[PDB]
Amino acid sequence: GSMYLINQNGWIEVICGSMFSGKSEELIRRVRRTQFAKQHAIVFKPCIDNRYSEEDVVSHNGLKVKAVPVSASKDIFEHITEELDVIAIDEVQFFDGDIVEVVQVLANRGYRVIVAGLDQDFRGLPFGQVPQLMAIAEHVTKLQAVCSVCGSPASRTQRLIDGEPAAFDDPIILVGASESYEPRCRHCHAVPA
Amino acid sequence: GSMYLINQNGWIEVICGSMFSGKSEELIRRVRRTQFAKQHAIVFKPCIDNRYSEEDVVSHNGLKVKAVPVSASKDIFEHITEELDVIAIDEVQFFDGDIVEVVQVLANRGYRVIVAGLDQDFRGLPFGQVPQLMAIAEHVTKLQAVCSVCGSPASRTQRLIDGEPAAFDDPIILVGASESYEPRCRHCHAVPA
Amino acid sequence: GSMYLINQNGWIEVICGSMFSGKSEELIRRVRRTQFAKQHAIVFKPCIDNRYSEEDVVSHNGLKVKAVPVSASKDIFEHITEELDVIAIDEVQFFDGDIVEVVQVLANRGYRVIVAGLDQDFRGLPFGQVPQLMAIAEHVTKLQAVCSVCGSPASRTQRLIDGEPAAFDDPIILVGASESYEPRCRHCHAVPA
Amino acid sequence: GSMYLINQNGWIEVICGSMFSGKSEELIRRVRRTQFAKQHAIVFKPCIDNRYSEEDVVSHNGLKVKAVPVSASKDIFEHITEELDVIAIDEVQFFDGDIVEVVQVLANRGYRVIVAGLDQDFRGLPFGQVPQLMAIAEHVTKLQAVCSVCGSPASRTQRLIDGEPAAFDDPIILVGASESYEPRCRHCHAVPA
Ligand SMILES: Cc1cn([C@H]2C[C@H](O)[C@@H](COP(=O)(O)OP(=O)(O)OP(=O)(O)O)O2)c(=O)[nH]c1=O
Ligand SMILES: Cc1cn([C@H]2C[C@H](O)[C@@H](COP(=O)(O)OP(=O)(O)OP(=O)(O)O)O2)c(=O)[nH]c1=O
Ligand SMILES: Cc1cn([C@H]2C[C@H](O)[C@@H](COP(=O)(O)OP(=O)(O)OP(=O)(O)O)O2)c(=O)[nH]c1=O
């Protein structure tokens, strides 16, 4: 018919869902495939995100990838060469208001942009600009973890403090607190005041 | 092991993408499957949406389903029985600010809520509350049409007026205008001023 | 990064599952997308397959596409031009032993070959050479209908004769018989002797 | 509508594709999800399969799961309790002729059976009884690796001996040979005689 199938580079993939749904696991396999395709990739993460590492992007499955920690979205530009093909960003919900513009510029320029972040905070509220990234992206993969109460598929992150469901208005940083995060379905998700 | 697999009803599925990506085609097959499963379904659409029908939900593939046209989101409640299992809503981007609350209430109540709508307007801007519906939904299916210029997969709706790309600020209703809508990829999508 | 993404044409997509799982519905949407991509497509079907049409490929959803009815697999070659990009074949389980070779030759030559057929006969046995097509294909989409007894997803075709489950060894053509076919899950599927 | 969604347990999932497509990576994430769902799982592998481990199921991503090595398919039965919910089998293409019967019996009994194996040998031939498992399974996931020559998605395992493509009739065990296996697309896959 016609030997080759020419297409245009440059698009956005969103990976979203609750904590432990596998966003970074999935970000990491996508970026790995990229290295076997002999393409050049870079991975960004927000400074604030230090749960498992300051330097790296780490999945709770135990796998990691080297990353560039960044404090404003527009700082991504300074790390970008023409040589690179793929830009991956983990924990995008923690990025400033620029992130949509940054990502659209990059996709318009020919970069494959892979973006992973929480769809919702612990309260069930749509998170950062993840909603907007979802709307504008060519691909959206919404992952589900397992509800830690009932076993069926989850779609929420449950914040617990001292073992009780967190309040709606509990600050994101509680200094000496014993807090924990687990996935739940919408029926076990509990947000009281 | 264990004869049966009990799960909890009540969740949200979003179907989104550009015009002609197949949102209503997909909404209609989902609702059909429902009838073979001997479940009861109802389909809502906005009053404003009269492209192919006032009464019905119609796909450009030529298939249709009976629907209830509604002018405010909260009017859905008056049409709901306990007997019904599935609530489908086409063209959700045209619904008022209540729609998220309406949908979350319905899913919390045990209804399977299937929601179809544009992710973006003709300008590439995230559309209504579709972004928020995407964030909060258990499932998101983002469909792609074919770019009518270059043939590769699309993610945008191109508005043309008199054959030229529409302006950014062109009103949604142009009285005697000759306008048309076609899918495009991000590279052929053209929004000038 | 790198403006364009060159790939090689020529591969095989299999669509399989029970009767009424949507194989032809899915074959037809794939072929339609092809026409909007301004590519040329041809659709083959076996002579034996006349349930809804002698001439055409028809889905129980009511949609159809023009087809070329063929009695041996190797007859496909006589209908193929260089101009065409896509070859679709419905009801592949009814094709002779050549079909795998025919399909592999076509994919090696640069054609996109889309193949739809039953994975299993009414007895639950792997059907024709669909198993082999599945093994060798780049893409396999296994569709599920709804179990007409219990409502959960199906994976089997139930043959009924006079309302009772057919026997294992009941001929495919029973002359004046009142027979019917419905999808079932593995638990409701009934094959006695 | 109706509080709960009762379904029947017992079905078959096939994961197939070339070497390095991620079959064990995918088998391992499925089995992990199972542990968070507080279900009991067991993983089998063939004795012959000792590439990374005698005891365990290992993915080239570096992740592993404890397994029970087995020499005949019917030996699976001796390891099965009523307490367990999930049976996973890696490298199924290396299992004897019983495997289909073993798997169908297990799914009919209520077990969730997850089966991973090569769709094709290094020659492009459909592998073991993987074709039959594909036909009869409720779910088929056909994974793709990256072609190590050209970068586009692969569907074949290339066997190389001394750096040259292996012959069609080269034995599976070559005693002191320097052999290697890499994924390729159908165009770079090379099987001479
Ligand atoms: C299904 C499930 C998996 N897991 C484990 C096994 C998975 O391989 C692993 C996936 O974890 P992650 O990949 O780290 O989850 P996440 O990536 O969405 O969060 P982040 O972006 O900050 O890293 O988590 C859980 O801890 N709980 C669960 O319910
Ligand atoms: C791929 C493609 C399909 N089609 C046709 C064939 C598809 O079966 C059909 C799908 O159309 P619809 O299903 O009507 O598209 P849409 O549903 O997203 O919009 P709405 O909600 O308002 O109804 O469109 C196009 O017109 N252009 C295209 O590029
Ligand atoms: C889910 C379901 C759908 N349907 C209807 C609605 C679907 O849109 C339609 C799909 O039918 P088809 O597309 O014709 O099913 P099939 O294509 O697999 O068989 P063939 O290749 O010979 O044509 O069937 C049923 O009849 N029973 C069901 O259980």
Ligand SMILES: Cc1cn([C@H]2C[C@H](O)[C@@H](COP(=O)(O)OP(=O)(O)OP(=O)(O)O)O2)c(=O)[nH]c1=O
């Ligand atoms: C895409 C790609 C990944 N990889 C790496 C990264 C993946 O995370 C990892 C997946 O490897 P595996 O999961 O081990 O591949 P496989 O599981 O299909 O084979 P087996 O059943 O015997 O274990 O392989 C390659 O080595 N080559 C490739 O082309």
Ligand SMILES: [Zn+2]
């Ligand atoms: Zn729960």
Ligand SMILES: [Zn+2]
């Ligand atoms: Zn285009």
Ligand SMILES: [Zn+2]
């Ligand atoms: Zn059933």
Ligand SMILES: [Zn+2]
């Ligand atoms: Zn190749």
